[PDB]
Amino acid sequence: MKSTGIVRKVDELGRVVIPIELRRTLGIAEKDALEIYVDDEKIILKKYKPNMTCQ
Amino acid sequence: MKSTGIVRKVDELGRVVIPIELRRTLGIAEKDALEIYVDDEKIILKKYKPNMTCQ
Amino acid sequence: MKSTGIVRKVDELGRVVIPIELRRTLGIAEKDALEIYVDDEKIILKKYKPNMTCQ
Amino acid sequence: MKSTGIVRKVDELGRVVIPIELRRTLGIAEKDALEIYVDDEKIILKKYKPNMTCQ
DNA sequence: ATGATTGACAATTATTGGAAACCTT
DNA sequence: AAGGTTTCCAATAATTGTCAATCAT
Numbered sequence: 001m002k003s004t005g006i007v008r009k010v011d012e013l014g015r016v017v018i019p020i021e022l023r024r025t026l027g028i029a030e031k032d033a034l035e036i037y038v039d040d041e042k043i044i045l046k047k048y049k050p051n052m053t054c055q
Numbered sequence: 056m057k058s059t060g061i062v063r064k065v066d067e068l069g070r071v072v073i074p075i076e077l078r079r080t081l082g083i084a085e086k087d088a089l090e091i092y093v094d095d096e097k098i099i100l101k102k103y104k105p106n107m108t109c110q
Numbered sequence: 111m112k113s114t115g116i117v118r119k120v121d122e123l124g125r126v127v128i129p130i131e132l133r134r135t136l137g138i139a140e141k142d143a144l145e146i147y148v149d150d151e152k153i154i155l156k157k158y159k160p161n162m163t164c165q
Numbered sequence: 166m167k168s169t170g171i172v173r174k175v176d177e178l179g180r181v182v183i184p185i186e187l188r189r190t191l192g193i194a195e196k197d198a199l200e201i202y203v204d205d206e207k208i209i210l211k212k213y214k215p216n217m218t219c220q
Numbered sequence: 221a222t223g224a225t226t227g228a229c230a231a232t233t234a235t236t237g238g239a240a241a242c243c244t245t
Numbered sequence: 246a247a248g249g250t251t252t253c254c255a256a257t258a259a260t261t262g263t264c265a266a267t268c269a270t
Binding site (some may be wrong): 111112114115116117118119120121122123124125126127128130132133136138139140141142143144145146147148149151152153154155156157158159165 | 167168169170171172173174175176177179180181182183184185188190191193194195196197198199200201202204205206207208209210211212213214215216217218
């Protein structure tokens with residue numbers, strides 16, 4: 001009902017943050033690594049995956 | 056080709072720092088608000104209209 | 111500045127500036143090598159010679 | 166001073182230089198601009214050109 | 221109130237610029 | 246010699262991690 005998903009300001013240090021209300025209510029998304037899907041002009045971030053290219 | 060993308064490492068406590076490569080390549084100013092839509096376990100990060108900015 | 115056919119400034123003493131992303135794209139370290147060749151009147155920059163599997 | 170196809174070592178830097186023979190043949194300024202373009206995994210640098218980002 | 225989340229600041233590392241040394245006509 | 250080129254070092258700054266303050270139930 002709050003600002004769980006829609007838009008948020010990016011930090012001046014170049015960091016995007018997850019809405020407080022979202023993470024504070026449902027920790028259904030961990031933080032450490034994520035999959036970057038560059039869909040033309042939109043960056044879709046999915047759950048972390050191995051995808052190891054080299055040791 | 057399958058459901059996979061670029062493996063990005065962010066902060067283990069949060070701070071979703073999008074790829075530095077794309078940041079400078081596309082020229083994404085990190086001083087405004089970016090759209091963040093939650094889709095199950097993935098989040099769509101984009102601008103109001105990134106397909107009509109440098110175009 | 112990506113290599114999408116974009117020009118960039120050289121240097122007061124003449125030095126080809128390699129952008130962060132470009133350096134990372136080539137996969138070269140601060141202990142690598144670059145083969146400088148020429149085609150007609152253009153500079154052909156070739157990455158380091160692996161000659162070994164990624165291990 | 167032909168250095169056509171010379172392997173330049175990359176030390177603790179990030180950017181490199183262009184061989185004297187190539188530099189002289191280029192016929193450009195010291196602080197000129199080189200058109201950076203890619204080729205699979207190699208790079209093709211042409212002479213100055215009015216090519217700007219998003220323009 | 222207290223533990224967890226987020227934003228701010230600081231430290232580290234990468235890159236670009238400049239100065240110095242060596243080479244060549 | 247001296248002008249040119251290249252290599253090394255220093256400075257700048259962008260980025261990521263740490264963590265301390267605050268708020269929600």
